Design an enzyme around this catalytic site. Structure first.
Site, short mmCIF file in Angstrom:
data_model
loop_
_atom_site.label_atom_id
_atom_site.label_comp_id
_atom_site.label_asym_id
_atom_site.label_seq_id
_atom_site.Cartn_x
_atom_site.Cartn_y
_atom_site.Cartn_z
N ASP A 35 0.82 -1.20 0.00
CA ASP A 35 0.00 0.00 0.00
C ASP A 35 0.86 1.26 0.00
O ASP A 35 1.37 1.67 1.05
CB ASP A 35 -0.92 -0.02 1.23
N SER A 199 -0.67 15.52 -12.15
CA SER A 199 -0.90 15.13 -13.52
C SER A 199 -1.15 16.38 -14.36
O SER A 199 -1.69 17.37 -13.87
CB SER A 199 -2.10 14.17 -13.59
#
Length: 330
Positions: A35, A199
């Site tokens: 994770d 992004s």
């Protein structure tokens, strides 16, 4: 040193991925959910409340000659999905794919929430976010990666998740045969303890690319792709019959649909998520309403590039002094 381990979807939907981890001496092998959105290595154990264990493999520290109680240490964590666990702490030897850390904090669960009990395939979590998020008190502990880092050939790990198929986590090297083209690297903020990046935009299907900054985290422990409501609406508007359902808890779509791809930007580069990756199947057994793999982050407080996005790429988690993230197509 290096390590390399195969990671395997827990079910037919890729709801999560499990990677075998050796703990203790003699080795006790547990299948952990790696994770990158948390920083505790915790396991089902011989100390876990019996009624809360249902088919998981447990770590029994009393059977490990290298286990030592970390005196006075406790831990307690709550995740974004509302699940939680807590307990005490041992140090022990932990190996992943041939890479060994001695003195790793192994957090032994005394209590786990129902979601964990109900998932027989996940024996615990192995956190790979920054150690500043580790919950051990009163002495915070380091992640497996943080402990291994100095010994690694290069201070990196990579995630290569499969679509309905096994993949690989590598530590200490970049497998140049595992991706196509070049790796595009992008800046990381560690201020919130996550692999947080920005992004450069998105496209829906064969549509034009929209240049826009989307701050989010690369999180292998989250199944879906969570993005701003504007982006998500633009995606699902291209699917006939798709709608946001408050009763179901997100966007659903007719199971008869063919989903468009979704592209996200990494610098001037582009990662394309095929439409099929966005299908999470019937909302309930036998239903013709299917659950979407792109969902709104509104009310989460952060955008999350979860497995839906990450499995479309070869992803480099670069833990150099100034950390960065790399993405390549594959």
């Amino acid at each position: 040193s290096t390590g390399s381990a195969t990671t395997t979807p827990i079910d037919s939907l890729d709801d999560a991925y499990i990677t075998p981890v050796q703990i203790g001496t003699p080795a006790q092998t547990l299948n952990l959910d790696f994770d990158t959105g948390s920083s505790d290595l915790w396991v089902f154990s011989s100390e876990t409340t019996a009624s809360e264990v249902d088919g998981q493999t447990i770590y029994t520290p009393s059977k490990s000659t290298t286990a030592k109680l970390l005196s006075g240490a406790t831990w307690s964590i709550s995740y974004g999905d509302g699940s939680s666990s807590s307990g005490d702490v041992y140090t022990d030897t932990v190996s992943v794919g041939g890479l060994t850390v001695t003195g790793q904090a192994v957090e032994s669960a005394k209590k786990v929430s129902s979601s964990f009990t109900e998932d027989s395939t996940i024996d615990g979590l192995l956190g790979l976010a920054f150690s500043t998020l580790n919950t051990v008190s009163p002495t915070q502990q380091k992640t497996f990666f943080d402990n291994a880092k100095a010994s690694l050939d290069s201070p990196v790990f990579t995630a290569d998740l499969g679509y309905h198929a096994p993949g690989t986590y590598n530590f200490g090297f970049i497998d140049t045969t595992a991706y196509t083209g070049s790796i595009t690297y992008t800046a990381v903020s560690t201020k919130q303890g996550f692999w947080e990046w920005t992004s450069t935009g998105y496209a829906v299907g064969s549509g034009t690319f929209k240049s826009t900054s989307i701050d989010g985290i690369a999180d292998t422990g989250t199944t879906l792709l969570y993005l701003p409501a504007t982006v998500v609406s633009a995606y699902w508007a291209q699917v006939s019959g798709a709608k946001s359902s408050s009763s179901v808890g997100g966007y659903v779509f007719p199971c008869s649909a063919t989903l468009p791809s979704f592209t996200f930007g990494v610098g001037s580069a582009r990662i394309v998520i095929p439409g099929d990756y966005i299908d999470f199947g019937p909302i309930s057994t036998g239903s013709s309403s299917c659950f979407g793999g792109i969902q709104s982050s509104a009310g989460i407080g952060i955008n999350i590039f979860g497995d839906v996005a990450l499995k479309a790429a070869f992803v480099v988690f670069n833990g150099a002094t100034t950390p960065t993230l790399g993405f390549a197509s594959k």
